[PDB]
Ligand binder design. Sequence first.
Ligand SMILES: CCCCCCCCCCCCO[C@@H]1O[C@H](CO)[C@@H](O[C@H]2O[C@H](CO)[C@@H](O)[C@H](O)[C@H]2O)[C@H](O)[C@H]1O
Lengths: 55, 274, 103, 65, 486, 57, 159, 66
Amino acid sequence: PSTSPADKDVPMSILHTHGLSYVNWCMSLAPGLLVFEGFFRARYYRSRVPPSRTV
Amino acid sequence: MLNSNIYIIIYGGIIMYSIMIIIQMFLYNFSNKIYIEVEINKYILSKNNIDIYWIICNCTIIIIITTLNHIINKIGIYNMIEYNICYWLIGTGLGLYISPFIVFGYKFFVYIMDLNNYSLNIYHNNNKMNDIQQIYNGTNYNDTMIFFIKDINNIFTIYRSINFFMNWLYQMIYYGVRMWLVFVLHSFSLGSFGELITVITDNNLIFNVFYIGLLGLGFILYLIVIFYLGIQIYVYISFSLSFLHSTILLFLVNYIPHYNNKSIFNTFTNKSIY
Amino acid sequence: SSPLVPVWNDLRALQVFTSQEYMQKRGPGFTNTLEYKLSCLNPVKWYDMMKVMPGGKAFVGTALGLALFGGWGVEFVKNISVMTKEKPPIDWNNEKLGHLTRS
Amino acid sequence: VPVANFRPKKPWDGPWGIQISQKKDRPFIAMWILFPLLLVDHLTREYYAYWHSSKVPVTDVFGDF
Amino acid sequence: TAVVKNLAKLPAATSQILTNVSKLQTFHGLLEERRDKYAPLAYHTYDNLKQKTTWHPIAHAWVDEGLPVSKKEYNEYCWLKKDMQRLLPLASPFVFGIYGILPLAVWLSNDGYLPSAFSSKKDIVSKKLEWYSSYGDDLRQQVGPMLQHRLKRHLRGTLNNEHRLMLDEVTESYKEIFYSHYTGQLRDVRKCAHLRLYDGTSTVLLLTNKEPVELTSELLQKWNAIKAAKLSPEEEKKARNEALIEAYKEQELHGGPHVKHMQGYGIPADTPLLGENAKGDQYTQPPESASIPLEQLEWTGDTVFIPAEYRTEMEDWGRELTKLANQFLLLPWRFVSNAWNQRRLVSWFEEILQEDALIAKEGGVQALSDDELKVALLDRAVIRCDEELTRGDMEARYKEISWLMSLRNPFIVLAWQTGYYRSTYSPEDDLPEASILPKLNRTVLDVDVHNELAPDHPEKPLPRVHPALYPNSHLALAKEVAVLAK
Amino acid sequence: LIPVSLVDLININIIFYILLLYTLLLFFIPLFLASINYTYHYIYKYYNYNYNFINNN
Amino acid sequence: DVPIEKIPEHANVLLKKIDACLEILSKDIGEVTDAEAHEMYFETSKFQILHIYTGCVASFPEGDVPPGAVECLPGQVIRTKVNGEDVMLEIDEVDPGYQVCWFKPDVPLPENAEILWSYPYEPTAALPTGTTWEEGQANVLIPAEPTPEAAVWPPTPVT
Amino acid sequence: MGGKASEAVTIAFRFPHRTTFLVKQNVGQKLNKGHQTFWQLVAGGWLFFLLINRTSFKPKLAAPKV
Ligand SMILES: CCCCCCCCCCCCO[C@@H]1O[C@H](CO)[C@@H](O[C@H]2O[C@H](CO)[C@@H](O)[C@H](O)[C@H]2O)[C@H](O)[C@H]1O
């Protein structure tokens, strides 16, 4: 039948994490999101020009 | 007990990961539609264009969506799904394989069942003996005492009919395996180089610094990954459709010239004579 | 595909047009021969000339040929790599196990 | 006398356009409910097996066991 | 409800059902007795792919010109055939079991699913009109537009290939036929006949003892003249063969029949002599009939109709267009091949032609009542019951579709019919306002059939000329004038 | 390597992925078709039947 | 039952109707001018927005920048108040051999500098007044917007 | 591996013949049809074949005689 063993329930803590290297973080592609969010937002909201007066 | 035959199914995270792939299709809104329209109108002209077009659109957009979720939305299955062979053989290749058999399946089936009655194709077949051989003997060839070996003949003729539908399967499998190998090996090699560099820098902490930069390296690797995978996806699509043309769609070339009509306002009928 | 395709096409055209040349040479009178009168009563000829008929009769003939003879052909192809192989003696059933009085 | 090729609406004319819009924007609404649910489903998840695990979670689908 | 309301009359309906079956059996016996001695044999023919039969009205829809039958009796025949079609759910308990009664209950729920016996009316015309106004016009009004769209998209093709598939000379006629619900202007049937330009020239090869000959208007005129002269057969056959050899020489000077240079058709040349059978320069072997002298040219009595429909043919229509045409004509369509639905459509077409012949024998449209003409137009599928047209408009509509169906082409027939089923609904209550002009009225005179109309050039449409403005119009329309004034 | 495996060739988990994906695709097809083209607006605006009248004089 | 003289009455009715239609349909909605709809056009500029309400803006030849002056390159957005009107100025096509900078009062101006526009001294003021561009100080160009000829349908002649 | 469409004939080369509707004059060939009692005897033979090949299920053979 359905089961829910206690082996899956284990302690958890962020202190025990090995973590990532600088290279793995660069390969995680977060910095690309960081740049390209602003890029695409800028392109979209800059395509639509408002009216103006030339001084 | 004896009658109990038990089977184990390995079930994981499927529902919530598969829902967002279809939900994203409203956002993408078939951006590849123009490209696939151009290619389909290059390769074939028939009333059933829209069918195959829509099919290819669905397949390609699913590929694109999965790839982008594999690059960006990294959770659970979205990472493995492009590194797995089952996805590359059944989730992308099988649909493209069965698409022409689902659009022009009537014509292909009739063609195959006519090719089981194997015969020599004559251009400008104004011959009479060809017709008598085809009706009386069944074929142009000599069919004397082939019933003696009919058991193999059936299946061999079946293969003889589908031999010109088999290279499509071969090319689909080949390019699916190619994409799987490309993704897997490039990811593995890149990660291996990363780990060796980190071992060198961990053993030499004068170098364990953001030596290229926090964003420079990441942006460059992002561009490298996306450029390479975009090239690979464009290759897999362009080649899939060009080989679809050159292998399956040249069968359906039926050019009808336009003949001017003259008897518009009057038609001869059975009552005109009888 | 191979580059011998035009060679095979030439040979096929050779045999086909030579058979037609033979039929032209012998001319009429084939219906009076004994071969024709037997082919009229031969089921191989009936099946072979029904195959090329319209109305799905090509599919019918092919599927009938499959269902009848192609299964034995598949078994034959499977047994080609079995004929040369060492096999054990057949454990023939003693036909003793199964009998049981009714109650 | 009325104008031709005009008539009152019927049930087989389908829903109105505003109703079709309300049908269209329901996936877009459920998006906001499901993407956070996706993130929560991933974050509040626990692995199912370990090197020490003597048992594995079983889910009898039809209650045959 | 209607279930119990129809169950109340279910006992009284079986006797009427059996009486109708007896009438149908007698009528079919009579009709087939006439058909088996006056009608030719239309052989079965298979489509381009040679797997399923194909059907065309020119060969299969025969009209018994001289049928001793009343128009109402033929209406009874067709309506009872449809009732036999509607009686099919009675087989569900005899194939599924005692639980196959719920399908019969669903059958008995709606009165439109049912045959004549469950109706309170008595006359066949009133009964048919009740059935139409209750169920049939509504079912047709929700298939008409989508069938019109399928016909459009069958001509113009799919996926932006109009520059490769459409013709630039039929463009204005196409627009006038398919977009007249935008303008509100009436349509000319000749502009719908212009759609046949997508097809080739329809030919008729008469088979002789030597060669086939293409039929022409001249040869047909001569044969009709000889048939009208009522001569002895020894002179009739002689004159026929004289005209036949004359036409043979004419086409031999023209360059052979039209079929020789048409893709998909062709006449073989003399057979070749292979190898040593070739006797020097004579590489050919003429047929046996080459020995026969040309003066003995006689018609075998065999004919070959070739519509040459390269874009219009019912084979290339598809799984959907045929089903929708049968829905629009209220025919059976579910779970059958396009060949069987084609035959059903051709049988309906033949029925309409025979009904036209019987009306012309009975004195045209004006001899009919208002309800009878309404029911006829409903059968022809050119009127919807939410219109309330005039008698002259109804007669003109009938004449239009009668001439159009005389050409024996279902595609243009459906293109014409679907134009009368494009109705809209407004979102506001005040709009559309009550009109100020009277209802649209016409006459049989307004229909121009006796005059040719060239296809209007693209983006250069021409106005419509009334037939009355033509010269000698009072002479040409004198029959219709006498019929209307009388 | 992990993906080099015969177990991952006929993975039932990915087969369930494909099943759910295309069932939802089938469910949401009629919403993907709900994009409007402006071609019949053009045809209504630009289609002009000949409105000139006949005048024998 | 419809004489020919009664037609022009119907024509008058339909002319009245279509004129009541066209007098409405002749109107059209112009471009939107709400700043809330276009604030992200300024948010996404290549430079941060300068909320300038004090000091002066000056043009001076290219070279060394005075320390303390805020450069105003092409693409620079400046929120100001001009003659009581809250406005955004986007710099476009600064002339060559010259550059423009915001000089706060703490910053001394260099030689050969030209004050393009200046602000008054109002430290106690909560709502600043901004500037006052006099005639000759700034050449403001209104777009001409030449309304072309109204599209008239050709009347066909009737002899 | 395998062939291509470029290496084979088309679905228009095969099945190149469009449709032609043959018609033949009525001389009286489908008249005076004999064997008026053919289908009655055919149905009788069919029912006879079904009766000889009929087998009712007799569960009484499974009765507990023992
Ligand atoms: C134009 C460029 C030409 C040179 C081509 C160079 C080859 C480039 C191959 C790009 C494809 C590699 O594909 C990429 O692999 C990396 C490395 O595992 C994956 O990266 C992932 O795994 C690594 C391995 O440790 C983790 O550290 C990282 O956090 C995670 O994102 C990316 O998710 C995947 O997108």
